[PDB]
Amino acid sequence: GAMNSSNYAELFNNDIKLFVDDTNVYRVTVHKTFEGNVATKAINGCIFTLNPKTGHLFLKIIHTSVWAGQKRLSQLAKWKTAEEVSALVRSLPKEEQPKQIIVTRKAMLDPLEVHMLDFPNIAIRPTELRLPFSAAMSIDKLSDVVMKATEPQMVLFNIYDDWLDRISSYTAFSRLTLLLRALKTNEESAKMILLSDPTITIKSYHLWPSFTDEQWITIESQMRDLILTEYGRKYNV
Amino acid sequence: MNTVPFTSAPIEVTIGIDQYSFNVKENQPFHGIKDIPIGHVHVIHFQHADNSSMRYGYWFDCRMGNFYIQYDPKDGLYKMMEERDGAKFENIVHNFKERQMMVSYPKIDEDDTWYNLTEFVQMDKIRKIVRKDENQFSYVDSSMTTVQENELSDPAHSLNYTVINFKSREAIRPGHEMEDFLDKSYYLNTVMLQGIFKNSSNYFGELQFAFLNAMFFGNYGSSLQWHAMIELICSSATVPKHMLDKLDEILYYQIKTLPEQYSDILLNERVWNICLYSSFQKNSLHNTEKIMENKYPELL
Ligand SMILES: CS(=O)(=O)Nc1ccc2c(c1)OCCO2
Numbered sequence A: 001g002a003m004n005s006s007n008y009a010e011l012f013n014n015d016i017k018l019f020v021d022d023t024n025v026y027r028v029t030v031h032k033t034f035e036g037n038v039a040t041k042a043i044n045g046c047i048f049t050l051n052p053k054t055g056h057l058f059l060k061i062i063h064t065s066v067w068a069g070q071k072r073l074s075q076l077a078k079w080k081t082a083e084e085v086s087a088l089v090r091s092l093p094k095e096e097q098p099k100q101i102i103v104t105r106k107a108m109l110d111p112l113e114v115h116m117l118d119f120p121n122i123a124i125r126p127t128e129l130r131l132p133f134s135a136a137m138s139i140d141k142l143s144d145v146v147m148k149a150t151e152p153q154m155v156l157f158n159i160y161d162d163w164l165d166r167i168s169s170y171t172a173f174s175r176l177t178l179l180l181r182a183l184k185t186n187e188e189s190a191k192m193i194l195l196s197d198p199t200i201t202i203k204s205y206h207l208w209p210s211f212t213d214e215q216w217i218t219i220e221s222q223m224r225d226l227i228l229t230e231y232g233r234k235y236n237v
Numbered sequence B: 001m002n003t004v005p006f007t008s009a010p011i012e013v014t015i016g017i018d019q020y021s022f023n024v025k026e027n028q029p030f031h032g033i034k035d036i037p038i039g040h041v042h043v044i045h046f047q048h049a050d051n052s053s054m055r056y057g058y059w060f061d062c063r064m065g066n067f068y069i070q071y072d073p074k075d076g077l078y079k080m081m082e083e084r085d086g087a088k089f090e091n092i093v094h095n096f097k098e099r100q101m102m103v104s105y106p107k108i109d110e111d112d113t114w115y116n117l118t119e120f121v122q123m124d125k126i127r128k129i130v131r132k133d134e135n136q137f138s139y140v141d142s143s144m145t146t147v148q149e150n151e152l153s154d155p156a157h158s159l160n161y162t163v164i165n166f167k168s169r170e171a172i173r174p175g176h177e178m179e180d181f182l183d184k185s186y187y188l189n190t191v192m193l194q195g196i197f198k199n200s201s202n203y204f205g206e207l208q209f210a211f212l213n214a215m216f217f218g219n220y221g222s223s224l225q226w227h228a229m230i231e232l233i234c235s236s237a238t239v240p241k242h243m244l245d246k247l248d249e250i251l252y253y254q255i256k257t258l259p260e261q262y263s264d265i266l267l268n269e270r271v272w273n274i275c276l277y278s279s280f281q282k283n284s285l286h287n288t289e290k291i292m293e294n295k296y297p298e299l300l
Helices: A073-091 A106-115 A133-138 A140-148 A169-185 A187-195 A213-235 B086-098 B113-118 B123-129 B147-151 B177-182 B185-197 B200-217 B220-234 B241-257 B260-266 B269-278 B286-295
Strands: A017-021 A027-032 A038-043 A045-050 A056-062 A100-103 A123-125 A153-158 B002-005 B013-017 B020-024 B032-036 B042-048 B056-060 B067-072 B077-082 B138-141
Touching: A017 A073, A017 A133, A045 A073, A045 A133, A045 A140, A056 A073, A056 A140, A073 A106, A073 B177, A100 A106, A106 A123, A106 B177, A133 A140, A133 A169, A133 A187, A140 A153, A169 A187, A169 A213, A187 A213, B002 B067, B002 B086, B013 B032, B032 B086, B042 B077, B042 B200, B056 B077, B056 B123, B056 B200, B113 B200, B113 B241, B123 B138, B123 B200, B138 B200, B147 B220, B185 B200, B185 B220, B200 B220, B200 B241, B200 B260, B220 B241, B220 B269, B241 B286, B269 B286
Parallel strands: A017 A100, A100 A123
Antiparallel strands: A017 A045, A027 A038, A045 A056, A056 A153, B002 B032, B013 B020, B013 B042, B042 B056, B056 B138, B067 B077
16 A cells, blocks of 8 residues: 555565656746746646655656647656556566655556556555655756757666665665755755865766765754754744 | 245345335245346345445346345355256246245336336446356345446446546546547547447446435445436537436436435545536536536535
8 A cells, every 4th residue: 555654664675666756857948928927838747656665767858849739738747657667667677677666756656557558466555754855856867857858868877876886775764865855955055065175076977976974864864954954934933 | 027936034134126125024924025127127125234344236137037135145145046956946936925924126107217227228238347257146235336436446347437537648638638628529539439338228227226325225336427418418528418317317317316415425526616607518418417406415
């Protein structure tokens, strides 16, 4: 059934599973027309499909051409997401296919179930966890590849860089969601924390800076403070 | 007119014949039901006074044989049987009518209710849903499960309704996943009508039979089937105009007949609100929407 804090430890077992987040698939800017009506302009989006044990991120870039001449785009976006996840599973060798797919939003359940009817043994599950994957487009290198795309494209990343050499995936996921949640709460501040120090750089083949173990503890504390800070600014506490 | 005689009535029981019912006392001088309209299927049904558990009954068509009821003290129920000796049977019925030991099927002449509830119901199709080929009549009770319920246990005692499943490979064409899930016209028209039922008359017959089993026996799997067959039509954008008009009439008479006090358990709030107020056919069921809004406005 649904994942939540009474059984989140199943994410780090050896059954292959993927999270699917669709919150950045259909993206728009809203603006005024010459006549003073309102219109939308779509911009490129992405499906965020992540293996939480390995860090492998299947970023399917959604080019605005896919919306041309279509109606009810917010509804189409869920079915297009399900179509692309289904196509991804079919492209993987059988021993790499997930045994479970966890959708971050319950409106993806039926679209994905219908597209995966050919895979009755793959469990499609919702989650009570409020995961911050909408903030993926705050990672500069991911945002860059989405906005530069001129056609549909899949790009593979490891969202944990090399962290698993030193920490467990339970810890790597803890750090990842804490970073994404901080980017979601106050993007400017979070990015200043991550990049204020010019001596720590991001390797060409990485997404995040090359922090020592001790530096990560400092960064993690600063992100905890930021999330607490914004909570007080928001609620006047 | 036809007659279903009773050998006797040894246990107190409420007896139904179609939409009518009456109480018989233990060992009362009751010897059956006369004046049954020829031309329609019928259902004769039972609820024991001492154990309302298990409503049960028999679907039959008087044109297919001479049928009677006899209590079986070993299996503890009223059983339908066929008498093949035509002369023995005529003799028995005449003696019981002469002595006036029978209730008369009480059809009002203005009244088309039973026809309207059974218009498309055929005994040959009932017998394929209820498999017991050595008898010309078909036994149904409150507890019998459907073939679909058995997939989610005795196969001999099951209701073999046509399986409808909106998230199934049969319902969804590869490459039209969104289209076929949000508009079920493919599943209704090609898969079900052309493919399985062959025509809308057979589809309506199964729909009507499912409702009647839900109403008369409280059969839960039958109520699920009735609602599935309604939902498949209402969730299709493309339905023949004559089917919509007939569906509206069918449902109208079904809602009209339903006991007011059983509406809570026989009607699925989600399906009806979807069908009358959200679906493609939300504006196509005028008679049904009017009787539902005036009779069961709570559900909506
Ligand atoms: C997604 S969240 O923002 O609620 N943070 C979260 C979730 C699951 C975890 C976790 C952190 O640490 C590792 C164990 O599993």
